[PDB]
Amino acid sequence: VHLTPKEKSAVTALWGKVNVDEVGGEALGRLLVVYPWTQRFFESFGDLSTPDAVMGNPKVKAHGKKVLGAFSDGLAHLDNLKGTFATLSELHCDKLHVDPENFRLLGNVLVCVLAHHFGKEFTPPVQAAYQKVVAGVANALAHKYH
Amino acid sequence: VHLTPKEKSAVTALWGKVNVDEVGGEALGRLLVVYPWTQRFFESFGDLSTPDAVMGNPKVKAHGKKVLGAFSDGLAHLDNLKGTFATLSELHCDKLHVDPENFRLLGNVLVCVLAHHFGKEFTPPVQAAYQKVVAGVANALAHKYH
Amino acid sequence: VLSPADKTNVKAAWGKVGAHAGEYGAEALERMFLSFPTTKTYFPHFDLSHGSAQVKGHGKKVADALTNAVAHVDDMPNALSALSDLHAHKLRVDPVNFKLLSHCLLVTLAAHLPAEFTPAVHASLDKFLASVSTVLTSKYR
Amino acid sequence: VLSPADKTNVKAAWGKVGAHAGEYGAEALERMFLSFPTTKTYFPHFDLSHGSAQVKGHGKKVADALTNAVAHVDDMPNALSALSDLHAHKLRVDPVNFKLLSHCLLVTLAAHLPAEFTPAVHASLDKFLASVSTVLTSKYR
Ligand code: HEM
Ligand code: HEM
Numbered sequence A, B: 001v002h003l004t005p006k007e008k009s010a011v012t013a014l015w016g017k018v019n020v021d022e023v024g025g026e027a028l029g030r031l032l033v034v035y036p037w038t039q040r041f042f043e044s045f046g047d048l049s050t051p052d053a054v055m056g057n058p059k060v061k062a063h064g065k066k067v068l069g070a071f072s073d074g075l076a077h078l079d080n081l082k083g084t085f086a087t088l089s090e091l092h093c094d095k096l097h098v099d100p101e102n103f104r105l106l107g108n109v110l111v112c113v114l115a116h117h118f119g120k121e122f123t124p125p126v127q128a129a130y131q132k133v134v135a136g137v138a139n140a141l142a143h144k145y146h
Numbered sequence C, D: 001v002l003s004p005a006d007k008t009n010v011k012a013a014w015g016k017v018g019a020h021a022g023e024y025g026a027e028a029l030e031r032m033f034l035s036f037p038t039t040k041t042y043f044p045h046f047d048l049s050h051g052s053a054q055v056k057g058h059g060k061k062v063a064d065a066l067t068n069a070v071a072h073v074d075d076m077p078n079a080l081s082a083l084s085d086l087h088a089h090k091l092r093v094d095p096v097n098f099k100l101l102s103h104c105l106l107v108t109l110a111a112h113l114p115a116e117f118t119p120a121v122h123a124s125l126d127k128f129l130a131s132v133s134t135v136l137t138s139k140y141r
């Protein structure tokens, strides 16, 4: 995906302020709460009975950190997302069989979490740049379906 | 997209029997009837007031022939759909701004038209091969969004 | 919303299915499993191969549920409430998958009922299956 | 379906929007136009640049419609019937676009109401906007 230099700047500047220990877990937790069918893939994570249970679940926070790591990795390779996500594509598509619509959903939940954390700093043009990124990541993760 | 030789055989064999003067118009007409918001892009085609009006509209039949031609072209280049649909991608995405979900819908309408015309000959494995094709075409036509 | 003509069209088309109801349901499932392999994971206790007695039996259940929806087309949320609970709560079926099965049901009807599958009836059947899908995905909590 | 807790959550969150209602609606539209440029084509008679009086005025209309939906949350098909006719018949708005505007409304609320946008309320608001979207796409004929 192609970001303008202004967009790249906006994206990288905000990402440097991201709490990498927490934001991924918040996004994964919210995915599980807002789109409850996604819990089907996380039976081994234990208590997902309430939103509080989900958000406070140590496995959700831990797995969310790995997800965010992958987004960070994609941000460093915007011109080669397919190669970057090849192994994860094989995992999520060939092994897990997650419908790729859910890749889009998690990306949009991440965008909501960024808006929540950054407030007015997450301006409409900053969002538009992040939408390009999370779309690129979703398409790359879905490559094994293509 | 990768078809097995058995799938390629099934696809090419059926396509040779396709009436290339009619099937494209039937698919485009049905798109306009079943998903009426798509009529927004065809204001210049005249009478679209009833299903009969749509299916009998000479412009719908004529434009459908061009669509089917593009699918035929894609069937001949299954290993390079992106290059094959580059100009059409620029048209449908950059110029027309058609949401790419509608590329998927037209492909699935085409699959319905093939089932209608071929009946029991359009077996579940033959369908599965055609779903790979129309997914590939939709993804290629959507490349300018990626 | 389903129009009077839609309800008339769906009732007429589904009326032609007859004793093939269960058969067409099984065929639609097979079409779905082959075309969209992600959907297979919902049925690990099923053998999904051709001629599977389990897919045959399940196709009859799907057809009976659709027949119930046709027979109670003005009261579908109520008629399908138990099935909505099952698919959304217990089974956690991804909403995308209802679009996939609906498409495969249309393909199955097109392949078997060429006289009935006019453009208008295709449109009515699509709206009907979308309405059924809306009810069956209405209970995620 | 919206649960009692969902209706309580939506009413509370929307209650905090206040005199900013029109403003947030305009911001959501701008977010949509910039993030998803396909949606721009519905507004050729609009200047979509920042600070556009037309986008500001239209944001107030969107907000007022949402407020009407909140106020009549148990009767939304009836409350939004005229708007459903408009969006589906006259304007022919692609159903995908409602998901795009709904997402941008969530982002706008998240950016302005950090205390209200809990995971539970996020879920309730998503269900509410999906319900609104279902009504506004219910009239394609
Ligand atoms: C942009 C979207 C996504 C990204 C970047 C992502 C990233 C990741 C990463 C980094 C891992 C860890 C892999 C490893 O341990 O080496 C993982 C595992 C996993 N993902 Fe995701 N993921 C995404 C979407 C999803 C969605 C939507 C679901 C289900 C609804 C899902 C289900 C899983 C599961 C079940 C695992 C554990 C697999 C295992 O441990 O064997 N993922 N993902
Ligand atoms: C797989 C999907 C599709 C294929 C293969 C396809 C193919 C084509 C082709 C071959 C043309 C003629 C281009 C030319 O004259 O050189 C065309 C034009 C056009 N298409 Fe499609 N199309 C698809 C989907 C759609 C959809 C879903 C829409 C709208 C709902 C759409 C709207 C249009 C319009 C409005 C034109 C006329 C453009 C012009 O004459 O300037 N297309 N398309």
Ligand code: HEM
Residues within 6 Å of the ligand: C039, C042, C043, C061, C062, C063, C065, C066, C083, C086, C087, C091, C093, C097, C098, C101, C102, C132, C133, C136
């Ligand atoms: C038109 C849409 C659908 C209809 C009418 C329908 C109908 C039914 C019926 C009647 C049953 C049996 C209920 C019972 O025995 O208590 C059932 C079960 C089930 N359905 Fe569906 N269904 C639909 C869509 C789907 C989709 C899209 C999926 C997944 C891709 C799905 C997955 C399942 C599963 C996994 C079961 C349980 C099977 C078992 O454990 O034996 N359904 N459905």
Ligand code: HEM
Residues within 6 Å of the ligand: D039, D042, D043, D061, D062, D063, D065, D066, D083, D086, D087, D091, D093, D097, D098, D101, D102, D132, D133, D136
């Ligand atoms: C939450 C979802 C939505 C709500 C509550 C909403 C509400 C409204 C309202 C209140 C009006 C003015 C009605 C009137 O003045 O008679 C309107 C008009 C309009 N809407 Fe929406 N709308 C929604 C989604 C959308 C979407 C997704 C699109 C397209 C991307 C869209 C395109 C339009 C257009 C083009 C007009 C006419 C503008 C004009 O000609 O002045 N709407 N909408």
